[PDB]
Design a protein around this ligand. Sequence first.
Ligand SMILES: *Cc1c(COP(=O)(O)O)cnc(C)c1O
Ligand SMILES: *Cc1c(COP(=O)(O)O)cnc(C)c1O
Ligand SMILES: [Mg+2]
Ligand SMILES: [Mg+2]
Lengths: 398, 398
Amino acid sequence: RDLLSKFDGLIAERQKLLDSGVTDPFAIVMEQVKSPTEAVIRGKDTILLGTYNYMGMTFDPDVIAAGKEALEKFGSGTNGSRMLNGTFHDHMEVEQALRDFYGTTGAIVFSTGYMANLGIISTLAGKGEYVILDADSHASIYDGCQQGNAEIVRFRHNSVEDLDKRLGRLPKEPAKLVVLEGVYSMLGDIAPLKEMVAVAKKHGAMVLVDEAHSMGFFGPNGRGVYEAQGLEGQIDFVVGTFSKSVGTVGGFVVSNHPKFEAVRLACRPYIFTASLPPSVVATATTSIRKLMTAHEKRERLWSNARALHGGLKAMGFRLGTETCDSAIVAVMLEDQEQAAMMWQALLDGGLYVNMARPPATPAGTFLLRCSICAEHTPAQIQTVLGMFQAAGRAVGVI
Amino acid sequence: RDLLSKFDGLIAERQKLLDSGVTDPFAIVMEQVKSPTEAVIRGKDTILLGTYNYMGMTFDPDVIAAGKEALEKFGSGTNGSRMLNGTFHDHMEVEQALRDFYGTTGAIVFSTGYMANLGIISTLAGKGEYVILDADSHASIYDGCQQGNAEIVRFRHNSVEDLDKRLGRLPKEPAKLVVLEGVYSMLGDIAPLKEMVAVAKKHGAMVLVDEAHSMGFFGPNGRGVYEAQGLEGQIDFVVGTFSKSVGTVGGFVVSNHPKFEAVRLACRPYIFTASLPPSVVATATTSIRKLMTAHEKRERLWSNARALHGGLKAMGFRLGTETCDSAIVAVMLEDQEQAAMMWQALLDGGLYVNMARPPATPAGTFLLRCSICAEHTPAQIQTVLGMFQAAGRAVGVI
Ligand SMILES: *Cc1c(COP(=O)(O)O)cnc(C)c1O
Ligand SMILES: *Cc1c(COP(=O)(O)O)cnc(C)c1O
Ligand SMILES: [Mg+2]
Ligand SMILES: [Mg+2]
């Protein structure tokens, strides 16, 4: 036995899944990517319906030109931390783009969204302070809690009442951070932010909202669910990512707090890593700025989501949401076998969606998660619906 | 008081430093970067001597062409995890390049080196197991320990004897991970890996060596200090980064362990983040492959390092090492004021080096850290030495 013996269970489980004849869902390779909505997988032209490229920015010609120009002018990397030699022209640009996008005075970019959550949670809340979060929060949020020294207070998923009761039992004096997500990504439902933020404020907590799954398409300025729910000016910190709507890699936190940017002086995941490559921050800058006014894309995204959500439900699929509330549409299946058969039939027929099974989801929950793109055409969405009808029948969903 | 009140001390300290008239060392912006060794800072042409671009790969024409081609062909980002939709052609390529570079069957790429350390340490060693590390290990290694549930065992810095004594007192049965760095980056000295690995093996521990500061220029194949010290085939895991010699962003761990790649199934910082952009993994692939045989660069790097190290010592600077053992040359100054005055005079004269003061360094240690590049010319190195002589005099080092 050695350090890897602990993986024997996971290795056996994987082999059991493969024994069913299914393609390994954790080893899919996009051999070619023709556009935000088309790839070649296993030598087959395939519609993409399992990416977080919500606004189709990855092939935007301005984004691509900015990336190429940055490679040419500044090279492939920075070879240093933001606190030393790794802040180039384009890093300053991308932080200003976030200030402009969110209407904040402060903006701190990290090398990943995971690291932004890890860092901001573990740095803001110290010993004797409290981080209060939804039971089903993103892994990076839990990892930020684990990385820090604060008291961690979970509340029942999606429960305004349990948030209120749990907050109310904490001592009044210590500072507190309530961490919320605008969109619950598993099912694509929306958090009751207006009510939860009111509860947080009643108890004197600061609020951090993750708006990774809403950027560019919720609220008048595309700032997120909090903006859509009228909370502009009430959110202490907003965390996000460059890997979804923005279409690259990176993380950020924005704020209007006067001391915010002193976080750079303390935050270990900000300090102890190289800054992002020039091309990454140049593509992010361009993309963020375009997202401020990408009205045609926003309209298409929501039109597509409504057509997919409406079509799957009408067919008889059980969805994670009664109404189309986000760009994630989750199809709920009865068991692991049904989900795998559906996923495989879709893939073989030319469609890629994400499958989620335990322990990614709770025991008893087996999903196909579809994520819509501004650049899907109405034709593609109908093709997808046809594919879902054909697979749902061969498998016997529906 | 709120969550940011804890930063009042750091804010006051920063203001005290600025009160001396020094440029803020934590807010330097590379406005233009002409080459690996030249930038424009504060409107002034400046020689770069504080980057980890050891092999000058960031402006390599093959690296740049690969990045541009990847933007064009695959877009700006992947919008998904490696376990879902984020593995493109170029991700498979970069992991194969690492296998070829290190002669291993296993290779796992992460979105940063920080995350590779965070993830591999917290995933390999669980409850009831031990992570044994040097007191002065990199922050990411300590953060990996904090993220995991293992027992953490620090040993006195650079002490083979204390490693042996501390290891020997642990229970025999539980699995153990000894984590070592090939190059101690603060001063640029080298770990006694041959002796430490022998000690680790005597006690039945697995060994993880970080070779971030040696890639491409230690050992016959450029694999690192462990290779230079004859330890090929004896190291269980080697961790590294794409941000130094490789010249982009990203992290990795390589191994020949038969179960290694099952780490993908468990490792939270691998699973819960987007994969790197196509351009990043394409530039990394190209760079890694060129590093396998970059003999001219290697020779220049070491020639430059020897000239800088030899020249600074002869001038009368106290260096962190008696002999030129790495591409980091650390100048030790008597106090914080001396270091800041030296740093400012160098900057104003057209040279950028890194300054390190407490709490980055231990109390009593005040450094200028020079990092050499394969692409520095002998002329630049003499210019640098002239600048060090001029500043050392105006300040009164030397
Ligand atoms: C996607 C996501 C992250 C991680 O972002 P990456 O940039 O991919 O590391 C963090 N939090 C939430 C809620 C996310 O959805
Ligand atoms: C630079 C470094 C890291 C971090 O690498 P990044 O890729 O910049 O996140 C981790 N460990 C060591 C020893 C390092 O030197
Ligand atoms: Mg094309
Ligand atoms: Mg140029």
